[PDB]
């Protein structure tokens, strides 16, 4: 009994270059609860990332929100990196302002 996480990477507000915002990585539909989640800036791990308290859906699958305050630019590439038992290798989901 194992369920692979669904991943969404997005911003709190519509992105505008040079304007302060929040980068979110929402992980859901996973089981068991142990999960590794990293927010990346140009392939390097952002240090000040926080997460929501562990909770779950009616189907018992877990959900967590990972976030950090950030300033988008044209030059910088943001991504979320997730590892879980159901994953042989870490999954990278790039931030796309249009999604």
């Amino acid at each position: 009994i194992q369920r692979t996480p669904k991943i969404q990477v997005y911003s709190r507000h519509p992105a505008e270059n040079g304007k302060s915002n929040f980068l979110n990585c929402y992980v859901s539909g996973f089981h068991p609860s142990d999960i590794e989640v990293d927010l990346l800036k140009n392939g390097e791990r952002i240090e000040k990332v926080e997460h929501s308290d562990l909770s779950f859906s009616k189907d018992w699958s877990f959900y967590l929100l990972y976030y950090t305050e950030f300033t988008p630019t044209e030059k910088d590439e943001y991504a979320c990196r997730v590892n879980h038992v159901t994953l042989s290798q870490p999954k990278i989901v790039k931030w796309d302002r249009d999604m």
């Binding site: 009994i1 969404q8 979110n24 068991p32 609860s33 142990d34 929501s52 308290d53 999604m99």
Partner: protein, 275 residues
């Protein structure tokens, strides 16, 4: 309208990785208001919504005390489940619990809940009558015999009818301005070419509360359910929510398509279109 209060418990064994961990979270509808984590240096029930922060020291001490006893009960429950299922003492296992109440517009009890799981599958659940149980397997059938023999449903029913409804009511008055004032979504349609013959139309709903919402795409007034891509409602991180709906459309046909938004903060549904 109708409202709900829920407590969610996760108890997890992890041999050789740490001691058994107990995490409790409390919700009023879609808003988390409290937490407890047995892994903190000094564990306490702690506020997670600003509207609960002014509860006196007697509320925090009483909640901390109950959470410490619950962590102790669930640690033992993990141990008994291993004997029930004839499992090795080396594996990692999880118990989940969800309980609480649903009230109507008046503030009167609509439905009580008390559901458990072992390793992500249903284990035992309290029935709607709040006086009988549904056991999913032969192991949960042992728990049922013990709970019937100890009259557990009776204590649960008294909580769900009394304290659960009364406390939910107090919390709704505490946070009246965020819990009971529906925040309408900020909406817009974006356009994204895929090829020279097709393009993507994306309808956005941002900053809304509660999480409940309906986004649909219509082509000349027919519902495009079969061809609409609907992303899961996600948290914005500020107690509001976000959602989008996308449709693939033939180039030069964008005018035929309308996005329709339904949310409780909207007096009438919205019709949007790209230009």
């Amino acid at each position: 309208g109708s409202h709900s209060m829920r407590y969610f418990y996760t108890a997890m064994s992890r041999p050789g990785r740490g001691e058994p961990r107990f995490i409790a979270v409390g919700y009023v509808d879609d808003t988390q208001f409290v937490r407890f984590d047995s892994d903190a240096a000094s564990p306490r029930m702690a506020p997670r919504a600003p509207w609960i922060e002014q509860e006196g020291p007697e509320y925090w001490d009483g909640e901390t005390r109950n959470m410490k006893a619950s962590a102790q009960t669930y640690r033992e429950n993990l141990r008994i489940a291993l004997r029930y299922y004839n499992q090795s003492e080396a594996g990692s296992h999880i118990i989940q619990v969800m309980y609480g109440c649903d009230v109507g517009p008046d503030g009167r009890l609509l439905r009580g809940h008390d559901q458990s799981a072992y390793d992500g599958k249903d284990y035992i659940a309290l029935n709607e009558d709040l006086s009988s149980w549904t056991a999913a397997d032969t192991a949960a059938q042992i728990t049922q015999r013990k709970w019937e023999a100890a009259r557990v449903a009776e204590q649960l029913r008294a909580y769900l009818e009394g304290l659960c409804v009364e406390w939910l009511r107090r919390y709704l008055e505490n946070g009246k301005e965020t819990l009971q004032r529906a925040d309408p979504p900020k909406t817009h349609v974006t356009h994204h070419p895929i090829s020279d013959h097709e393009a993507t139309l994306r309808c956005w709903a941002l900053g809304f509360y509660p999480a409940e919402i309906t986004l649909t795409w219509q082509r000349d007034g027919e519902d495009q359910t079969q061809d609409t891509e609907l992303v899961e409602t996600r948290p914005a991180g500020d107690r509001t929510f976000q959602k989008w709906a996308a449709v693939v459309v033939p180039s030069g046909e964008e005018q035929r398509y309308t996005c329709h938004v339904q949310h409780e903060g909207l007096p009438k549904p919205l019709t949007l279109r790209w230009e």
